[PDB]
DNA sequence: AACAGGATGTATATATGTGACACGTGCCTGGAGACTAGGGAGTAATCCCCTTGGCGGTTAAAACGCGGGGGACAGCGCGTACGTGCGTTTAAGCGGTGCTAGAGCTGTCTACGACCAATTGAGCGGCCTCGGCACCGGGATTCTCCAGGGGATCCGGATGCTC
DNA sequence: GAGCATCCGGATCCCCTGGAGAATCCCGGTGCCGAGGCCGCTCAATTGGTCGTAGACAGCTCTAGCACCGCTTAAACGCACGTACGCGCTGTCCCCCGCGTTTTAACCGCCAAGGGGATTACTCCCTAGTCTCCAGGCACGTGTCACATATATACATCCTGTTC
């Protein structure tokens, strides 16, 4: 099981499968942490946390899709910190 | 093509032309690089320091030859007379286009059996007292063709028969007995 | 379009997976929507050709890596 | 030249619950009916302004091939950096209780609708006058061309071995 | 002692470094003179503002029950170690162009005026929705029963991926 080619097997399974990749409560306590600084004792419903998680997962997946094309552009495969800089700024997010 | 580059620094260059006398063999300015190319004796070729050393016997130390070599290499590339090898194993080794024809790469076995027998021929008599004799273990047929014993044996017979000079044939029993005499000196008996 | 995906997916009831598949497959539907997030939609396979080293994993010059 | 190995993907019958529907009652709200009624549109003449081209007179942007510098593509390569293999530990769900306020009932005040005439604002509407912008004559600014004695490092030259 | 092509030290010359005057250029900094923002006279319907009254949406008051913060164990996931090659990065110049420099005059461009067609003011009349002012059917919850496919299990058995 070569580590480079096994990752290709994961791509086929994860793209085919539909599920929440990140943990629920660690994300639930994460969003609660941010809310406390913005507004102390700001409560969340179960639906709100899941909606935030799914939007965050899709947003991160899209960034991974774009950064993947940045790697092949530089005649490379792996993602480097330079890849995330080019993708974010060109979308009008970073600057 | 400004004056400070066409008359101000010129006099040095036309003054020193076609005077590599110390290397008597092919002293022409255009032929120094090529002479180094044949003298290198390697498959990859000569790198920068190798070609500099091979050119350097005298008459060349490099007040401006360091950049003149690059300019001449550009001229030779424009002429299309240079073939080279890339990679970090050979740091820009260069060769002159000596009809060492380029072809498809695949088919590189990791041995050279035909020339593998030469080191044993060099070693065995040299390890003995009788020094390495003339190249008589295999004849010129070895690089005429590449065949087995019957075809490599019939051809020497024709080689000797076509030369019908009796006087020439007399030498094969006057130059060979020297080996017989030296077989007394190198081994003590037989 | 989603209903055809369910038969291809060996399922009867339409799941959010088929909703994404119907939208993604039709390029005209991509212009209408696709800058959005679909709950449990999934992602259509988009494997790139830079991966999958179809050539022998041994070195190009020789067998040794 | 091509077989072994261990797990993942297949059929095929096998269990369950939650998701789904079907009754059976119950009750507003959303559609439907059918005229009287005042205000945005179909439909006629009016009127100037907008686009289509004559129609010449210089001038600053294309159009294209050659030249010599250099930067993207691509070859190998030694060592750095990230994904498999195996393990225990502690982070996750349950899913009945209990406790905040979101959401839903009463009844009254409040700024916001609505008719009806006078009265300041603020472009039109054709009439005159002005201060910074932009075109155009002059030179100021780094690179480019010259003149000096010789120097240190080169191209010119001196010197070494075995039959 | 000679002859030949590999290295070594002799002596005569010219290009790095540096500071200016040569005359070019290109690019900045004053001169000059039109056209679009202003000031002043008038010209009037929108449009706030005013005078004088009436019909409801929304903060109080507070109710009744459902939907989240702790409780309380029970399983399984994630987190952590090392070892190895896949793959950054350097070094290097094929070789194929982007850019500079000249022709080259035709193309973009603005000056002094007309017309035919089309986009807003002004006047007339007209057919949907819109208050009257009432009526009855759909379609949404609360109980009450009773099911059908999704989601994973027991047997039984092949394809794929990555090495030696």
Swiss-Prot record, chain B:
UniProt region (Disordered), positions on chain: 1-29, 87-190
Xref: InterPro entries: H1/H5, Histone_H1/H5_H15, WH-like_DNA-bd_sf, WH_DNA-bd_sf
Principal cellular location given in the protein's record: nucleus
Superkingdom of the source species: Eukaryota
Biased composition, class Basic residues, residue ranges: 13-24, 104-190
Phosphoserine modification, residue list: 23, 30, 146, 167
Alphabetic keyword roster: Chromosome, DNA condensation, DNA-binding, Nucleus, Phosphoprotein
PROSITE patterns: H15 (PS51504)
Cellular compartment(s): Nucleus; Chromosome
Cleavable signal peptide: none
Every H15 domain range: 25-98
GO process annotations (BP): chromatin organization; chromosome condensation; negative regulation of DNA recombination; nucleosome assembly
Gene Ontology molecular function, alphabetical: double-stranded DNA binding; nucleosomal DNA binding; structural constituent of chromatin
CC per GO annotation: nucleosome; nucleus
Pfam families: Linker_histone (PF00538)
Tissue: Erythroid cells.
Function: Histone H5 performs the same function as H1, being necessary for the condensation of nucleosome chains into higher order structures, and replaces histone H1 in certain cells.
Assigned protein family: Belongs to the histone H1/H5 family.
Name of the protein this chain belongs to: Histone H5
